[PDB]
Amino acid sequence: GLMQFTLPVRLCKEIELFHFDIGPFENMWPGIFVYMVHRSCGTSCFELEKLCRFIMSVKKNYRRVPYHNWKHAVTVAHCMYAILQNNHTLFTDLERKGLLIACLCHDLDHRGFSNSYLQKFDHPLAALYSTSTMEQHHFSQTVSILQLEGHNIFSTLSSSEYEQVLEIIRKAIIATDLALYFGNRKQLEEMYQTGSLNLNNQSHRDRVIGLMMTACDLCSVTKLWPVTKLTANDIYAEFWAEGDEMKKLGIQPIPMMDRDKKDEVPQGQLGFYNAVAIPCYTTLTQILPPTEPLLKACRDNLSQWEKVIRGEE
Ligand SMILES: Cc1ncc(C(F)(F)F)c2nc(CCc3nc(N4CCCC4)nn3C)nn12
Ligand SMILES: [Mg+2]
Ligand SMILES: [Zn+2]
């Protein structure tokens, strides 16, 4: 009740910035998450005992893959924290509650393979969920963990509040399917530019929360260059294992997933920052101006990838 989570001074100041790295000490990540809920939501949003048990069951359901792991979950949640704290007054209490949980949960039980590989392998999850296969799985795992004894962090909510928050989390987790991002950002771009964008329209809110999810999900491109560059090595460690598995099924992988195209990595990054990252953070900055430091950091990392190609990095 009278209990506040605190952090050492360098973490207490730097956790408020978009470019914070949560560090290599795994055992601090739960306390960092609770810290962020307490400040973005309040010490009253969740029963501590339930939240702690929820966080630990979530952790235990992330797998030790190179990229889609528990460290990614807490990272994606820290970027959401930064966005929420810089746009305090645009979001409901349910949204604040819902989005940090959504982010912590958004890759639950990820196996290090894309929707496309599950569909080519004919994994049972691809018969249960024909599109956004892992993302429907992640929400399904979130509901499982919420239904364990002593894990319903939302038990204090009304039936209708409970249903709204699970609906926010579902839509937020689905939006992390990058196949959906392109159309979502296009609509948002057109709505912002024609001035039709209306934050009282629930279906507009949805699209805006969807774009925030894509921004948080991609936030490795918004970090200090060494973090960005070393995360890219984890990302490719997964993509190249997937490429190997595609070849095992007798299918030439796309170049992104082929370890034989290691040398094209710099140009593949440029394509990615130009086709995905920069547009994502541009539109987000138009809609929520205090998120500009994510766009400014993305453009700095693009220019670091340009330096690598020129031989200067
Ligand atoms: C930094 C980052 N964050 C998130 C994601 C993701 F979308 F997947 F979440 C992501 N994907 C990639 C991969 C980019 C990429 N490499 C390549 N090839 C072509 C041949 C050499 C490399 N083609 N392309 C488009 N980087 N990356
Ligand atoms: Mg995902
Ligand atoms: Zn993710």
Swiss-Prot record:
A divalent metal cation 1 binds at residues 72, 106-107, 217. It comes from the Eukaryota. It is found in: Cytoplasm, Cytosol. 3',5'-cyclic AMP binds at residues 68, 269. The active site is at residue 68. Residues 1-312 form the PDEase domain. 3',5'-cyclic GMP binds at residues 68, 269. Abundant in the putamen and caudate nucleus regions of brain and testis, moderately expressed in the thyroid gland, pituitary gland, thalamus and cerebellum. A divalent metal cation 2 binds at residue 107. Changing residue 107 to N: Reduces activity 1000-fold. It is linked to Dyskinesia, limb and orofacial, infantile-onset: An autosomal recessive, early-onset hyperkinetic movement disorder characterized by axial hypotonia, dyskinesia of the limbs and trunk, orofacial dyskinesia, drooling, and dysarthria. The severity of the hyperkinesis is variable. Belongs to the cyclic nucleotide phosphodiesterase family. Plays a role in signal transduction by regulating the intracellular concentration of cyclic nucleotides. Can hydrolyze both cAMP and cGMP, but has higher affinity for cAMP and is more efficient with cAMP as substrate. May play a critical role in regulating cAMP and cGMP levels in the striatum, a region of the brain that contributes to the control of movement and cognition. The tandem GAF domains bind cAMP, and regulate enzyme activity. The binding of cAMP stimulates enzyme activity. Homodimer. This is cAMP and cAMP-inhibited cGMP 3',5'-cyclic phosphodiesterase 10A. It comes from Homo sapiens (Human). The gene is PDE10A. The chain holds residues 724 to 1036 of 1055 of the full protein.
